[PDB]
Each structure stands twice: as structure tokens, then as C-alpha cells.
Enzyme design. Structure first.
Site, mmCIF file in Angstrom:
data_model
loop_
_atom_site.group_PDB
_atom_site.id
_atom_site.type_symbol
_atom_site.label_atom_id
_atom_site.label_comp_id
_atom_site.label_asym_id
_atom_site.label_seq_id
_atom_site.Cartn_x
_atom_site.Cartn_y
_atom_site.Cartn_z
ATOM 1 N N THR B 72 0.766 -1.243 0.000
ATOM 2 C CA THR B 72 0.000 0.000 0.000
ATOM 3 C C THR B 72 0.800 1.299 0.000
ATOM 4 O O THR B 72 0.234 2.367 -0.228
ATOM 5 C CB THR B 72 -0.921 0.058 1.214
ATOM 6 O OG1 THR B 72 -0.129 -0.057 2.399
ATOM 7 C CG2 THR B 72 -1.946 -1.067 1.171
ATOM 8 N N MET B 73 2.098 1.217 0.270
ATOM 9 C CA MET B 73 2.937 2.414 0.310
ATOM 10 C C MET B 73 2.521 3.326 1.462
ATOM 11 O O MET B 73 2.623 4.549 1.360
ATOM 12 C CB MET B 73 2.841 3.196 -1.005
ATOM 13 C CG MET B 73 3.491 2.524 -2.195
ATOM 14 S SD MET B 73 3.286 3.488 -3.713
ATOM 15 C CE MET B 73 4.675 4.584 -3.608
ATOM 16 N N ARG B 74 2.038 2.735 2.550
ATOM 17 C CA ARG B 74 1.633 3.518 3.715
ATOM 18 C C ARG B 74 2.814 3.618 4.670
ATOM 19 O O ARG B 74 3.074 4.673 5.243
ATOM 20 C CB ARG B 74 0.461 2.853 4.449
ATOM 21 C CG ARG B 74 -0.015 3.642 5.677
ATOM 22 C CD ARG B 74 -1.097 2.895 6.455
ATOM 23 N NE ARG B 74 -1.731 3.737 7.470
ATOM 24 C CZ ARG B 74 -1.402 3.764 8.757
ATOM 25 N NH1 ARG B 74 -0.432 2.988 9.224
ATOM 26 N NH2 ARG B 74 -2.050 4.574 9.584
ATOM 27 N N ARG B 75 3.525 2.508 4.838
ATOM 28 C CA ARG B 75 4.673 2.468 5.734
ATOM 29 C C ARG B 75 5.796 1.617 5.153
ATOM 30 O O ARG B 75 5.548 0.648 4.439
ATOM 31 C CB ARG B 75 4.262 1.889 7.092
ATOM 32 C CG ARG B 75 3.202 2.687 7.848
ATOM 33 C CD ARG B 75 3.765 3.994 8.372
ATOM 34 N NE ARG B 75 2.856 4.654 9.308
ATOM 35 C CZ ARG B 75 1.908 5.521 8.963
ATOM 36 N NH1 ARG B 75 1.726 5.857 7.690
ATOM 37 N NH2 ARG B 75 1.137 6.055 9.903
#
Ligand SMILES: CC(C)C(=O)C(=O)O
Ligand SMILES: CC(C)C(=O)C(=O)O
Ligand SMILES: CC(C)C(=O)C(=O)O
Ligand SMILES: [Fe+2]
Ligand SMILES: [Fe+2]
Ligand SMILES: [Fe+2]
Lengths: 264, 264, 264
Positions: B72-75
């Protein structure tokens, strides 16, 4: 089966004529030209010319004054080709002459859209939850585009969509093949959308279409209110891949908090 | 109208200077460079070098340890070009040195973002439902991308977005034309997002922008909490094509259950 | 780390064998071939041939009778290449022979999918809110595509997805590189989806994959019920960029009112 896109006179439909043919068209094709509905190349000229004049001779300042702070193409001017959008309220008009011309044009489009939707409901014996008139007093969106594939294949999420436009770029799936949809100076093109399919319990087809690759097009979406309510089991029965808990749901529950006009 | 992207000193704004010019910028352009905000090429060097070192010399095992189970490219690390993302909590750091350097960098970005958003609210006389500080103690997302059109035209759905970066690829619509946005070693670039438009009742523009086609960019999204509440009629008034029943709604009601950072 | 896509016998897993290796695979790769699950090229032949026969020799009328009024690819025939879809109910079959053959094929796919998902849950010590069996008695979707990049990189939003298929076009990210996924006449390919990641608290990876550019593929999505409930704080902990107020949420709250099968 004949893959010809038929034409229906709104007046004749309201008289109870061609009912079997109309029902057939709605079920097997989901599109048709509509005559005798108060919309022709005549009622379009005035609006077209004045907006074209704006697109071509309007200054950056004048365009700015009628441009929304968020580029949503909901109201006013948009530079995607250019576009002008409007609804029942909260509109942005560049001049008094423009407002008079476009308010009348919008009214004619809204009246014709409600009228044909009324016939779609009657021909299918459909009584929306909450009644017909409450269903039709909705949230329409008119978009005029100027183009001095050009649009991927998709279907509309409207009740019905009315198109006027002005080489034949517009094409729709009919009989399993893409059929050209030329302009009719004496008629408006009508595409049935997913909401027609939904509200009628699957009696109406929402045809896929696209635009192949200079012209203008007027697209009017007759869209339901956020609180439009329907049966979840019935929706599943006609193809909707819903993820809704419970027996009934609203348009907002299904689509979310922002209107979505098309789907691929 | 001058289509120059202006520059504002955060300190001078907090002193009540250039208010008319700031309000004008927010309304007509929605973007500007920001100086004197604790962010320059100096505070970026440390973070940049260490992450670049990771992208280039990190082993597949080390990268795996800081990669989320869902891409997700969140963390953590993401291989889209490579990217490193972080927030206020639940972060993934490859080393102690890395964590110290990036935690400080994130804090400076978050502080600057809240500060300029605070000025945007003050200049427009805006008091968010629930108060200013509760609105600003939100859900930020920092994304650092390494690129050893490259991005379609879109607008941000943030309150404000801060960009540092390092040929001018970044371009934004200004005055009706795409203007280049070069890096300023002494300033950070600020794009106003749709939430600024929404919360201020349409007093702030959310400009469209894109990336034309090797460099790095640091993008910080200041995003509202899920329960941020706003007026539905007011949202309609400034361009939001909402499908929300009732008079008030939350960010979650509008966007859904997953954050959406940009919109075309 | 070895980037080989492993193979597991369903029977051996149900016997409590290879547990450490299975857990490792789920965490580091999120994909594997599955044997001894009642699905091979044998149980596929019958269904394949009869649907291919339909795609090639079916008349426009026969195809129309099994085509949904909205082109959602949820049930029946779809012309995107062609596709045939089905679920636990509300199906559209062209003939009695077709129905018998495909109902049995669907049942075998659903049984195998629930069985391997059951093992994924057991190996990770996961007890879904509401229990394992209620979680697995869900909303599956089977799609058979005939193709007489071809699909952008994405991850699945299913619990698990089973693929059979028939040059190696299918590729998935393994160890940080795209690995080919050839067909195994004796096994089915299993991709773990985001729901496996979510329900297990991040113990399972949802791998990205795509299709490079004539063949057929059978894709079975094991999807949760709309009311599947999970912990919001836990979701945040493993990478989900949720915008959900409160401590618990449902699949419907997260994804919305319409199933979404993949995400880029
Ligand atoms: C371009 C027009 C014809 C259209 O299909 C739409 O806007 O939905
Ligand atoms: C690429 C950067 C500048 C951007 O616009 C974004 O991430 O929203
Ligand atoms: C094309 C198949 C393999 C797929 O990935 C999907 O449908 O999600
Ligand atoms: Fe359309
Ligand atoms: Fe952006
Ligand atoms: Fe997939």
C-alpha cells in the site's frame, strides 16, 4: 435480432403506443433515439453558439470567475478540450444572456429526461420505493464539451443519459457489436444507465459505449437522489456485485459519498 | 493576472503580514513556495542520503524486514522506482541511525504543514467543526520517492501537501496554463488540496498538477481525521459533487473507508 | 532467501505437516501451488471444452439469454476476449449439460478454496470475529476467461484466489523480482489476498502480480461477507491506510457497497 438502434416519439409513447416494441428495446438494447420531446438542433443552436463564443473569446479572467475552486466539472468552466457544466442550482454563469439561454436549455433537457424516464418506468410496471415523482425530482448534471479511443468503453450509472452532439465517433454495443450513433438534428440520443437496470429489477439494459478518435457534445445525466432506496436481493438478481449487509440499501450506500457517473 | 507562483515567509505570515496577498494566492492559485518554516535542503540532505543508501545498498532481506505485507505504500519500503513511507506511528525503520534521522525529518515536515495550514485557516476566517487544533492533529502521510507523463494530471485530496524534491518535471496549472515548479533549496513547495477548499467554504483553490518525463521527491500529505465533519450544502456550493443525504457529513462518509490521496 | 514458488499438498497440510514451512511461505511470499485438493487438468477439461464451445459456436441469441443487463462480469457471459462468471446462486446457464458440468466445477473450486483458507487460518492461529465457518461461508466469484502488459500490476482483495489457466504470461513478485508462474496440470495456483493479510493481523503477504502479453484462465475469488468484522487499530498495524472512525469495522465499511476484487 435486428441490431438497428430504434427511434421512439415521446408523444406516441405517452399515448400508450409501441409498448411491446419499447419494452423490447429497453431489455435487448437499452438505447434509442427520441423525437417529439422538445429537443432538436434548434433548441441547441443558441446555447451552443454562446458557449463556443465563451470558450474561444472568453478571457482568462472571465473564465476564472466561473471556475470552481476544485476541478470537478460539476459547475462552470473546466479545461480538461473545454467543458461547461450545470445543474438545478449553484450554477456559474458568465453573463446575463448566457444564463437566460442556458437555463432554458437545461430546463428542456431536464423535462425531456424526466419524461422519458417516466415512460421507462411505466413500460416496465415499475414503482420506485417512495414513488415515481420523488424518484424523478433528483440530482441531474449537464455537461457540454468542446473538442476543437477518445473515451474508453464504459456504461453509465445514471437512470438515463440524453445526448445531442453535432465521421461518427460515438459507438455503442448492439447485438454484440459496436454500432455507430450519428447525430439526428430532429432527435436526442438516449442511453439507459445502471440505475434504470436497478430500479426496474433488471428489465432494462445499460449498454457499453465509447468515443473513437473536432465536435461538440451535450450530455445530460438524470441521476437519483442519495436516499433512493432499493432491494439488495433484487440487485444481486440482475448482475450487481453488491457488498451490502441487510435487505435494503440507498444509492449512497452503494456508490459512496461522491457521485460516480460512469463505470468500466 | 500575474501567473507567477509566489513565495511567502511562514514567519511573516504568522506576524499578520501580506494577508491580502496570501488570501488572493489561496483563492486564485492554491499553490506557493514557503520559506522560514524550518525546512531547507539542509534538513533534507541527511534523510535523503541515508534512504538513498538503503535503496542502493540495502539487501533483499533488509528491505523485506521493512516491507508491509500489503503493498500500500503507507509504511516502509515499496518497489513501484522505489519509495519509503512513514506516519506518526506504526513505522518500519531499517536501522537506529535511519530512525533518528527520519523521525526528526518527519517531525519538521509535520510541524511546518500544520503551521501553514493554521495560516490558511486564519487568513480565511475558518473555524473547523470541532476546532482548529483537533482538525490539525490528524493523519499525515510522508512518501519519499527515488527515480534513478510520469504522473497523470490530478489534484490532491489533502488539506495541504508539502513537497521538497531535488529539467523541471513538476508542473501545475496557473492562470490556465502549466507552469514549471523548480526546486528552491531555501523553501518548500505547498499545494493546497481539496480539503482546504472544503473546510474554508471554497476560499481556497486545489490546483491540478502532474509530472513530466532521474531525481528524488519528498511528498508530505496533511490529511484530516476520518471524523472531520463538514456542511453538505456548503460542499455543494463550492463544486463538490456529493451524494450525501442529510445536512452534515464526515470525511469517511465522503471518501469511504480507505484514504484516497489524489483525484483525476 | 530462496525465491522459488513452493508447492504444498492440501492433504499433508491438513495432517499438520510442513507447518513452519507453510507459515514461512505465507509470510514471505503469499503464493504457492496446491496439490491433492481435488483440482487438476482433469476436472477442468469438461468445463473448459463446453464453455469454449459456447464462446466459439454460441449464437448472439444464446449469448444474450445468459448476459446480465449490466456488464459487470458477475454472472453469465461477458465480452470484454470473452468471459463466463458464476457464484453460489443467481447463475445464468446456456444448457442443462453446461449447468451440470459447471456447477460441479464451481463446487470443487469453492471446496478447495475454503479448505486452503482454513489451513491459512489454522497455521496463523487466527480465529475470525464470528468464527471460522461463518467467515468461510462467504461470497465467492468464479471467472473463466478466453483469450483466443495484458493486465497491469495489482494485488487481490480476496481471502485467497485460486487459478488454473492452461510462453508464461502470469508473473508475480517474489523476493523482489517478477517470477513466472507456469501451469501445473496436477495443481492449482494460490494467491493470498489482502483479506488474508487483514484477518491474520499481518501474518500473510498479498503479492503483486500481472499478465504479460492465446490461452484460457480460471480465476476463483474467495471473498468475505459484507459484515465480516475486524479491528481498525490492527488493520493500521499491518499497512492498511484506513479512514475508519472507531475501533471495529466491517468489510462493507472499508471497501464500500460494491465488491472490488483487485487494487493497484
Ligand atoms: C462522451 C459521452 C457520449 C458519454 O458517454 C458520457 O459522458 O458518459
Ligand atoms: C508527485 C507529487 C509531486 C504529487 O503530486 C503527489 O504525490 O500527489
Ligand atoms: C488474471 C488473473 C491471473 C488475476 O490476477 C485476477 O483476475 O485477479
Ligand atoms: Fe457514457
Ligand atoms: Fe499531487
Ligand atoms: Fe489478481
Amino acid at each position: 435480432m435486428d441490431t438497428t438502434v430504434p427511434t421512439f416519439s415521446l408523444a406516441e409513447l405517452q399515448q400508450g403506443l409501441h409498448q411491446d416494441e419499447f419494452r423490447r428495446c429497453l431489455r435487448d438494447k437499452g438505447l434509442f433515439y427520441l423525437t417529439d420531446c422538445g429537443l432538436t438542433d434548434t433548441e441547441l443552436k443558441s446555447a451552443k453558439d454562446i458557449v463556443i463564443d465563451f470558450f474561444e473569446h472568453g478571457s482568462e479572467a472571465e473564465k476564472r470567475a466561473v471556475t470552481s475552486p476544485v476541478p470537478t466539472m460539476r459547475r462552470g468552466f473546466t479545461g480538461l478540450s473545454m467543458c461547461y457544466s450545470m445543474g438545478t442550482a449553484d450554477n456559474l454563469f458568465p453573463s446575463g444572456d448566457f444564463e437566460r439561454i442556458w437555463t432554458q436549455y437545461f430546463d428542456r433537457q431536464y423535462t425531456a429526461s424526466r419524461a422519458v424516464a417516466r415512460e421507462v418506468l411505466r413500460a416496465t410496471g415499475t414503482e420506485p420505493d417512495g414513488g415515481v415523482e420523488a424518484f424523478l425530482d433528483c440530482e441531474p448534471l449537464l455537461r457540454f464539451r468542446y473538442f476543437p479511443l477518445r473515451m474508453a468503453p464504459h456504461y453509465d450509472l445514471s437512470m438515463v443519459t440524453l445526448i445531442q452532439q453535432t465521421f461518427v465517433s460515438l459507438q455503442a454495443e448492439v447485438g454484440g457489436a459496436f454500432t455507430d450513433l450519428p447525430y439526428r438534428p430532429d432527435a436526442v440520443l438516449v442511453f439507459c444507465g445502471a440505475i434504470a437496470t436497478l430500479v426496474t429489477g433488471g428489465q432494462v439494459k445499460a449498454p457499453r459505449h465509447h468515443v473513437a478518435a473536432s465536435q461538440t457534445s451535450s450530455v445530460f445525466f438524470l441521476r437519483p437522489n442519495a436516499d433512493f432506496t432499493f432491494s439488495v436481493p433484487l440487485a444481486r438478481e440482475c448482475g450487481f456485485d453488491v457488498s451490502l449487509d441487510g435487505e435494503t440499501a440507498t444509492f449512497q450506500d452503494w456508490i459512496g459519498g461522491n457521485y460516480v457517473n460512469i463505470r468500466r
